[PDB]
Each structure stands twice: as structure tokens, then as C-alpha cells.
Amino acid sequence: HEVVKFMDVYQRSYCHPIETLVDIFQEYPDEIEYIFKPSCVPLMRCGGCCNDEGLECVPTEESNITMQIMRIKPHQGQHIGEMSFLQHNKCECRPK
Amino acid sequence: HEVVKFMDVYQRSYCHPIETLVDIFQEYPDEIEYIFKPSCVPLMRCGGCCNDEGLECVPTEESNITMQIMRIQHIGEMSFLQHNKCECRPK
Amino acid sequence: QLVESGGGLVKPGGSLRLSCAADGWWFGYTDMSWVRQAPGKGLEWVGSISYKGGSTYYNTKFIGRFTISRDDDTNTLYLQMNSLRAEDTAVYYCARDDGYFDTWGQGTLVTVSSASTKGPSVFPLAPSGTAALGCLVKDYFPEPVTVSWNSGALTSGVHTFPAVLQSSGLYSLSSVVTVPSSSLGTKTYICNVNHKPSNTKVDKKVEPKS
Amino acid sequence: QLVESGGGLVKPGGSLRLSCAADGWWFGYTDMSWVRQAPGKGLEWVGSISYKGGSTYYNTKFIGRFTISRDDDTNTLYLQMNSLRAEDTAVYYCARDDGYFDTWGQGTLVTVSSASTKGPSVFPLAPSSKGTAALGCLVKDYFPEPVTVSWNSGALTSGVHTFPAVLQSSGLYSLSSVVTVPSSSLGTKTYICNVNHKPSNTKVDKKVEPKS
Amino acid sequence: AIQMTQSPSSLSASVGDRVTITCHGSYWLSNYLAWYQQKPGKAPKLLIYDGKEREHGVPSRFSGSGSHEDYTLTISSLQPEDFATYYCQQYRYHPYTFGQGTKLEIKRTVAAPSVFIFPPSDEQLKSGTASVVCLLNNFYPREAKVQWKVDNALQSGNSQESVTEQDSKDSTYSLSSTLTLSKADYEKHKVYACEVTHQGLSSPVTKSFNR
Amino acid sequence: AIQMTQSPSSLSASVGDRVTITCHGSYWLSNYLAWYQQKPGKAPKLLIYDGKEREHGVPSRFSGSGSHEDYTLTISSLQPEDFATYYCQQYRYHPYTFGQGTKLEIKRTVAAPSVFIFPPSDEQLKSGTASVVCLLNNFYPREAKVQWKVDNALQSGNSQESVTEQDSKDSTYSLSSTLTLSKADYEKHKVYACEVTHQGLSSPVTKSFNRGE
């Protein structure tokens, strides 16, 4: 039995940029051609608690990361092409 | 400009246990008498892609982790489910 | 205990199967891991398989490309390796998975390279208190070469050096032993040189010339 | 350039404010970080503040307990530290945040301990009878760190060796500074060690001469 | 993926010293942690498992400790056979992750090499190449200069060295130098010499042979 | 939180050697990476920023390289003042994370200490304690034995040692030993000696003084 101390938990759960898995379809729903391999990507995005419900965990600095994704025409063609995805370099607890 | 190569992305996105932030309410609704600080916890849970939509990313080995959480006001321990090992199994 | 076969030479892109044979029924009732280790670098879990066989698992850089298989009848673990690069040149250990690894094999060396297998010449280093003699194992590829002396009956005093890669692209290795000077002539000294890749085995006697 | 004040001795649980003074207008137009470093251990980002003051940010071990503040008029950066433990005994650097850190202060030492401030006695190591000859200053029984030692007020630098402080069984520090110089020069030429221990407000300018 | 951070990379201690090796995990591991000893050439041996449980046969001077993220292997009274490379391993969350490794080196008294020199085999001279071998046996520390000489002609470049790992009993290094040249060139010259310089020799030792 | 893994923890190389320091990130960093040189007692100094961009004044022998996760500081022709401790720093994702550090030590020729011994000050004898000091000045390598002697009696357990960091010009260590004892005990004995053993001395050097003489 091991107990993570209050202040350890509060600190590591606090609003920060964290490796987050994001479905490529949910990101780009306008997609009527290609099934994606991988189906999802690991993106550094904001996430975590904020001290009081008044504040929300929001990104202060944003940017794109570029990844070789396999685009599959399920019956027809299939190739590796690059796709950009939003990522969050820095985050904050800001009032809603 | 920098490009992550296909096989790097496929591998890192693959079904694995990953630090996942989980709202303490959404886990335990039966506690409607308390506000929690922190509001959420970082838990090792399954997550990621599976090669084809037929399979779903599921836990093979499960267990509890214990954390000092502030219930509003006293600090008391709470167990949370965590996922030690994961797999791509057919739905 | 655990005994890895399958190791040796493989062309880039090529495939290789490692088999690992476990001695007892107990193999049927435990998880089984592979751990690998690149020359001079450190340890790295490859992957595991569950007790009945329900689940396999892989470290990140093997997910797309290695398959772990298990035969609970023959008590044999398997690692299928595809799309091999230099990065994969390493000693591959069969090991007992229970979170920690309580039982290891001696491991087998998978070398990923373009060049051809070639077996060594074994030349004696003859002796002229304490006196030194040895064997020169020359122009072989790939690693490894094992050297023993008088079939294991002579162990203290021995030094089997690390192999040097020659400008030629072939390895050369010395094994030497210090022994009493009185003992030369009276006692017989044989180096046992094995190079499994080429199926070269030699029992070279070292004696003092003239 | 950048100059940290506020450092020194603090009781466990206690608070402390670090101020860092920047020389020029440019301070108004950059992000500003604090980086800290424990004796012998490595570097560690504390936290930063944005250009106008829009955002503050903190490393994980400080989120609940440090506050970074900035006065764009005086060109001063501030680090408020609360709930201090041994863990926090470290040199704290003020530094210019642009992702990388192109400008640092000299840094100041925050020491977290129960024990009492005490200033050093400064005793000479006087050169003997027998080319090259050695002399120095013994800075004894002080707490906490640090002690600076200079020789002839900075006019003498080459030849010098100010040793790392050793913690005595007494819980007080002791430190030697020594300098090698020409033997001919002794008597003709005057040698003063400048010993400063800011915590206790002890300064000594001790002349070291050869004894009769 | 839980990142393990072992320290130091390497270290160096005398026989009898208490030694510390630290391991930090990126998430709380709750003693799902093992320490391995690997001696040069052979597979890992388990030492500590579940953080502080000692594997059967492991001496009592190896002890494990820590909790949460930070764990510590302690070798209490260091022995010459403890020369090895120690790793920690997490097994709470897939994938299993190890530390980078800690290469432990034993300090000991200075110790001169015994030097031997070997002419090339007549078996080998037949083959058409000549390999001349210089042996420095059981010395400390590792830093030695072998210098070749062929009729007083100073060889620079055409020799290769190999060094044994530190010996598990006497903590000594051993070294072999190999001067390679053509059978033709070999039969050109008369006196083959290797001169050995080392802390434990008052002046350099030299072994020679005439063809 | 992006974990940086610098290697090796430390290393030791001769003047003119090419030196390699590696840094691996837990996520792709795309050159949002800097290399710092920190000399003992001073703040870190920036060398490389954005992976391979060289700060003004930094010599051309310090170079950065790598991509994705794996990055490499290269000091091409090592100099005696490159003795320092090098860190890498990620700045793509909060929080900023550094590597563990790489302590770089210069190799050089053997060099014997010059030894000096100091009686305790009369100012200090007044205070009631006696501190006797032994100085080993500019030697290489670090491994030296100081052994104290009070009327030929081997002192055991009453002295403390301090070793300077490696000198930025001549790459030498310097060491001070401090034999502490009571004014009473001090005024008991006659001959105070420190004997120094070191690779660069063919036999051990000994400096002594008689309390009065």
C-alpha cells in the first residue's frame, strides 16, 4: 500500500500540456475520402484541474506538429502524406 | 519545419497505458455531497489506435491507486481504478 | 533455465525467428518476456506473452514489426523479427516475466549486416616461475566466438580478449592463459574455439616449438 | 545584466521574497524565468511570467506554493516562496525567458535551516622561511554559506585557491583561501585577504605578513 | 511509457565502501521495481525485486529502498566481484522500462603488467599474413602505453589493442596488442619488440625476439 | 512533462579530443533545445540554442545537432577551459526541463604537488582552538594521500579535506587539509608534520615545524 500525498496529486493534476490521444476524424470531420492509419495521434494539449470552477484550463501559446499519416482509400488507393495538427506549448488557469 | 515519420506515429499512437486526467466526480457520482481539490487526478489508463476499427483498446491487468484528495474540508484517501497492461481485442 | 536458438547473421530488411527452449512444465504456467541489449548499450524489454496465450505485448519500437508466439507443448517461446536494421543488432534474451525477470537464458546474438559469414583460422601463441601462452582466432564474421581451455578443466589464469574489427571487416580475437613454467611439456594445453555461425569447431594444442 | 537580492537564511515552513533587478527598459519587453539549483545537484526551471504580465507559470513542485510577480516600472522581477523545506535550499537564478535563457544573474543562496547565523573569525596562514612561497587566510566557524574571499581587493587573482567550505562536526563552516607569490616579494609587497560573510554582516580586510 | 532515470552513469569505489545507486520514475511505482546485476559477457542476474525483497542466494550487503518515484540500490561493503553494471526496472505499467545503467568500477593498489610477446605461428606464415602479439597481464590502473619496434623502426598506426573487463577477483585489467604485417615485410626485419609504459613500472619494460 | 536524458553523467578527455554529449526527449522537440556550459561557482552560460545556433562569442568547436528526440553537443578540439558541466534544456512544452548534467574533466600529464604547512595563528590560539593547515598546490591527478603526524604519532579522524575544482588554464587540482585540536593538546606536543603521497612523487614529501622553533 502506497499513498500519494495531497500536494503531489494537486500539483501533477494542475493545468499543464500533456500527451493526449486525439482521433484524426474528430479533428477533421470534413473527410469523405480517407480512413487513417494510425486512427489517432498523440498531441501535447492542455489538461487538468484549476483550483476553483470559476477558471478553465486554456492554452496561452499554440503551434502545429506535422506527422506522416497513412491515408487509405478503403477499396482503391493508399499512401503516406503529411498532416498538421494543433498542439499547445503552454497553458494557464484563466477565468471563464 | 520537422516531420514525424509514419512508423514513429503508428507505434506511439498504439494502444498503451498512458497518464490520463480523470474528473473525480465522473468516476464516483455516488458522492454528490462533496467538492474535490484537486477536481481531477492523473491515472494510468489504456488509450490509443488499434490498426483496424474491428479491435478496441482494452485493459488486460487492472488495479487501484490510492491518493490523498481534499473533500470539501478534510484530506482523506480515495482509491481509483488504473490499467497496468492493455491490448487490441476484437469487439 | 532457458536456451535461445535462431541467432546469427541477417541482411538488412530481412526476417529472423528466435526460439527459446525452457526445461520444465513450469513454462506452461508463467508469462514469458524477451529482453534485448545492443553491443555496449543497456537493457531494453522487447515484448511478452500471457500465461494461456490470450495476450501479447510489445515495447514501442517493435509494435508494428515483431510477433511473439508460444508452444505450451514443446515448452518453446518464439520471437519473429521482420524489417531488421542495424539498430536491431543485439543479444536477445529469453526471460521469465512476473513483472521482474527471475530467470534468464544466456542470450543469442542477432547481427544485422550485408557481409558474408566466414569462419576463423586458429593459430597458437606458443610460450618461449610463470609463463604465458594462447590462441589467436583470426578473420571471422560475424560475432560471437567462444574460447575455453582444456575443455573447461583450466579456467583460473585465463583471459579471452574482446574481438577487434579489422580494417578488412573481419574480427580477430586472442585467448591467453598464464601457467607454471615447470608444467610446459609435462602438461598438455588445448584451446577449444567454437564459431557457431560458420560451424567451425577446433581443438588446437599449443606447444613450445623448438 | 540581472542582480538577485532577497537570499539568505529561512526557518522550515517559513516564507522568503527574492527580488531581481534588471539594468534596462528591455526587461519590459521579455518573458522572465527563475531557475534554481541545489548544492552539487543540477539546474531546474522554477517558473516564468509573460511580457505584459498576462500569464505566470510554474514547474510542478512549486504550483501550490510560489508566486512570481513583476514591476515593469522599477524593472524588478519577484519570487515569493512559502512552505520552504530543505529540498528548497538552493542558489536561485533570475534569467531571461525566450524558451532558452540567453541572460542570467549571478544567483543568490536561499538556505533553509533551524540553526543560527554566526560570522567567521579570520586568522592568517603566514608564510614560513623557505623561489615560490605560500600564504593565506583561514575563515572559521561561520553559518550559513556563503563566504566570498578576494586578495588585494581584486588586484591579485592568478596564484589564488579559495577552497570549498567543509561543514565541521560543530555544524559551522570553515574555509581556507591561499595564494602562491614570489619569496623575494614578502615584506616589500603587502597582501590583504578581503573576507565577506553577508548573512552576519561580517567584513574583514586582514593583512597577512611573515611573523617575528 | 514510464521513463526511468538511473544515476550515476558510472562510479568508482574501493573494496569496503558503501555505494548508492538512485532510480527515479516518471509516475508513482509503489515498489513495482527490481535491481539487476550484469557481469561482462553474461545475462542479467536479479538482485532486488518488489523494491526491497532480496532474491535467494544474493548476499545481505545489496539492499533496496525507496517508494513513490525515487528508489536506491545500496551495496554496503563493496567486494572485487561486485564489479558489474547495475540496472533498475519498473514493472507497474507496460511497457516495462529499465534505467540507462550504472557501470561500477573497483579502485585498488597500483600493479605492474607482466609482459609477454608472441612471434607469428608458422601455420599462419604459410597462410601469407604475420600477426605479432604483445600481452600485458593483470595490471592496474587501465592506462598503459604499448609501443612497437621492428629493427628499431617505431611502428605508429598498424597495431590494434583490446582490454579485458576488470577481473572479478583481483580487479586487474589485461591488454593484447596486435602488430599485423605481410609475410614479405615480416621476413624483411629481425628484432620485434614491444615496450610497455605503466604507473607500476619504475622504467619501461621491453620484450623482444629475433626471427 | 517532457523528460530529458543526458549522457554520460560525466566523462574525462585529453586536450585536442572530440567529445560527444547526447540528450534524448520523451516527445519530439523539433530543435526547441539549448546547450548550457556552467563553470564551478558561476551561473550557466548559453552555448547552443534552437538545437544548432551558436551564441555570439562561443567558439566554432562547440556544435549542436540532432532532430526529433535525440540531440548531440560536440566539443570538437577540447581545451583546458572547457572543463565545466554541460546541460541540455527543452523549451517546446511547459514545464521547461533540463538534462541531469554532464561533468566534463580534462586529462593531462602527471604533476606533483608543491606542499606547504602552516602552524596555527596566535590570534586563533588566544580563541582557545588550534587549526594546522597542509596545502597541496596544483597537482594531477586528484588522488593524493595526506597523513598527519604529531610527535611521529599518526593522527586518525581529526582532519577535514577540501579539493578545488580543476583549474581552467593548467587543469590541476589543489587540496587543503585542516588538523583541528584543543589549545591544550596543541601545547602538549612538538613536531607537526603532513606527509603527502602522489603519483608524481617518487617517494612521499613531508613538511614539518616545531612549536617554538
Author numbering:
A (entry chain DDD): 12 to 107
B (entry chain CCC): 12 to 83, 89 to 107
C (entry chain HHH): 3 to 130, 137 to 218
D (entry chain AAA): 2 to 131, 136 to 217
E (entry chain LLL): 1 to 211
F (entry chain BBB): 1 to 213
The authors write:
We discovered that the human antibody Fv region can effectively be divided into two functional paratopes, comprising HCDR1, HCDR3, and LCDR2 on the so-called H-side and LCDR1, LCDR3, and HCDR2 on the L-side of the Fv. The DutaFab geometry provides spatial separation of the two paratopes sufficient to allow for simultaneous binding of two targets to the same Fab fragment when desired. In order to confirm and further analyze the binding mode of DutaFabs, the affinity-matured DutaFab clone VP mat was subjected to X-ray crystallography, in complex with either VEGFA-121 or with PDGF-BB.
To generate a DutaFab against VEGFA and PDGF-BB, monospecifc phage library selections were performed independently on the two targets. An L-side binder for VEGFA and an H-side binder for PDGF-BB were paired to result in an initial bispecific DutaFab (clone VP), with a variable region amino acid sequence as shown in Supplementary Fig. S1. In the construction of the affinity maturation libraries, some framework mutations were reverted back to VH3 and Vk1 germline, while the VH or Vk outer loops were allowed to deviate from germline, to allow selection of enhancing residues that may potentially modulate conformation of HCDR1 or LCDR1, respectively. Following independent affinity maturation of the L-side and H-side paratopes, the most potent paratope sequences were combined into a matured bispecific DutaFab (clone VP mat), with a variable region amino acid sequence as shown in Supplementary Fig. S1. In addition, a 7-fold increase in VEGFA-121 potency was obtained, improving the IC50 from 894 pM to 130 pM, while the already high potency towards VEGFA-165 remained similar. As intended in the DutaFab concept, all 3 CDRs designed to be involved in H-side paratopes make contact with PDGF-BB and all 3 CDRs designed to be involved in L-side paratopes make contact with VEGFA-121. Calculating solvent accessible surface areas both in presence and absence of the respective antigens yielded a water-excluded paratope size of approximately 430 Å2 for the VEGFA-121 dimer on the L-side paratope and approximately 292 Å2 of the PDGF-BB dimer on the H-side paratope. VEGFA is a homodimer, which signals through VEGF receptors 1 and 2 by bringing two copies of the receptors together. Strikingly, examination of the co-crystal structure of DutaFab VP mat in complex with VEGF revealed a close proximity of the DutaFab molecules when two copies of the DutaFab are bound to a VEGFA-121 homodimer. This observation prompted us to engineer the interface between the two VEGF-bound Fabs to make the simultaneous binding of two Fab copies to each VEGF dimer more energetically favorable, thus resulting in co-operative double-blocking of VEGF dimers.
